[PDB]
Structure formats: C-alpha cells, structure tokens
C-alpha cells in the first residue's frame, strides 16, 4: 500500500497473507469464512507451495493472534487468463478451520444487484495489505489500509494501456500518491455500509503503483458471487 495508514487493532481482520516456503508474504487474500480464503488467481502462479496467515499486523513481532493455515485445495477460475489478468479470482479451502478472534474475522459477501447499485456507488472502498509502500520500495512490515475512491469506468478504460474487461473495475486516484501495489495483490477491497464491510474487489493489478493518470484495477467480485458460492461448497 502506497500512502494510506496502518490498520489499527481489529480494523482489518479479514486480511489474510499468502506466504511462501521461506515465510515471506507474496500476495494477499480475504477471509470469507472459517474454511475459505478469496484471492487472485494470478497469485497462484507466483509460488509452488504456500500457506495462509491470518491475524497478522506486524510481520516483525509475533503478537499472538497470528495463525498459519495449510491449504487443502486451490480453486482457480476455469477462465483465468494470464495474458490479460481477466477472471483473476481464486478460492482456497484450508485444511483446518480459522478460529475467529481479535484481528481474525471474515468480510461479508454481498448480493450482486444491491452491491452494484449501492456498494459500488459509494464514494470509496478500502484496500489493504503488506505490499510495497512505493513502486520500487520494499514490502511493508505493517499491515496497511487505504481508502480508494471508485473510478469512472470510462475514465478508467481510457487511462489504461491494457484492456479493462467486464470482470474488472478501477479505484484510486489520478495523481494523488495513494494506491495498492505489489504484494497487496489478491488482497481485500471492501466497502463499508452502515458499519459493516462487504468484499467488493480483489487487488488485481495496475501499471506500476500510484502513477499519474493510472488507477488501481481490481477483480469485480460482484460478477463472481455465484462462482464463489459454488466453490465454497466443493
């Protein structure tokens, strides 16, 4: 996360972190339930074996709420295409159930129609993760969060050098130095409605990070609600 603030205690409990063999985070995820993590399909193509960590806020100090979980099965979208990042969504079923507690809780899955008309029309959404703090900087040691305004579909399609499919949407700023970045990928994009946070996107990609005239591109979760529902029962 470029800019933004760090998630204070209990503020981003749905944040999960995919970690490689050497315990280093390389992507994000969202806790959907005791058994499921929602992530970016393109993140799976980033490491052979990995596990999921939840309840973490400072990768440089075991606070005690952290829990590492093994992945039982990975569920990649059949139509995911590496070339364009289209259909960038994946669901993970853990071997053991996540025990909810302080800093470990799921985000709500919204209903498509209501979310598209009411959630996605809110001023902003929140993105978070342990990703880079600068386009060329090091990964973050502290979990960060950032309020990213929804970006006009057409203004976004125009701003991008790559195709913006119907399974993507944009958020962020045109010039302001705030945006998600490498490491946050697969992470949560949620929208707050009356003190309840709903998952609305999956950090997908961008051209660099916080670049002028460039936005943050997220997987349009509302377009895969039926898919997520199916995967979470298989």
């Amino acid at each position: 996360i470029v800019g933004g603030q760090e998630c204070k205690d209990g503020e981003c409990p749905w944040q999960a972190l995919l970690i490689n063999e050497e315990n280093e985070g390389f992507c994000g995820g969202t806790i959907l339930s005791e058994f499921y993590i929602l992530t970016a399909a393109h993140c799976l193509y980033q490491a052979k074996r990995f596990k999921v960590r939840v309840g973490d806020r400072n990768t440089e100090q075991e606070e005690g709420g952290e829990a590492v979980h093994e992945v039982e099965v990975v569920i990649k979208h059949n139509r995911f295409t590496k070339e364009t990042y289209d259909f960038d969504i994946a669901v993970l079923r853990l071997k053991t159930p996540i025990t909810f507690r302080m800093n470990v809780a799921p985000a709500c899955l919204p209903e498509r129609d209501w979310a598209e008309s009411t959630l996605m029309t809110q001023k902003t959404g929140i993105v978070s993760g342990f990703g880079r703090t600068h386009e060329k900087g090091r990964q973050s040691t502290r979990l960060k969060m950032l309020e990213v305004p929804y970006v006009d579909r057409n203004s976004c399609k125009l701003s991008s050098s790559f195709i913006i499919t119907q399974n993507m949407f944009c958020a962020g700023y045109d010039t302001k130095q705030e945006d998600a970045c490498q490491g946050d990928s697969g992470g949560p994009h949620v929208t707050r409605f009356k003190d309840t946070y709903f998952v609305t996107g999956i950090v997908s990609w961008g051209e660099g990070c916080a670049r002028k005239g460039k936005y943050g591109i997220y997987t349009k979760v509302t377009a895969f609600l039926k898919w997520i529902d199916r995967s979470m029962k298989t």
């Binding site: 209990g10 302080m102 899955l109």
Partner: peptide, 16 residues
C-alpha cells in the same frame, strides 16, 4: 435491521 447470529459476524471490525 440485521442481527448477528453469533460471535465475530462477517463485516465487523473486532473489538476483543
């Protein structure tokens, strides 16, 4: 209104 069915319901930041 929507009432939480149990502890740590979805979408709520944790307070304990």
């Amino acid at each position: 209104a929507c009432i939480p069915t149990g502890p740590y319901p979805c979408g709520k930041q944790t307070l304990e």
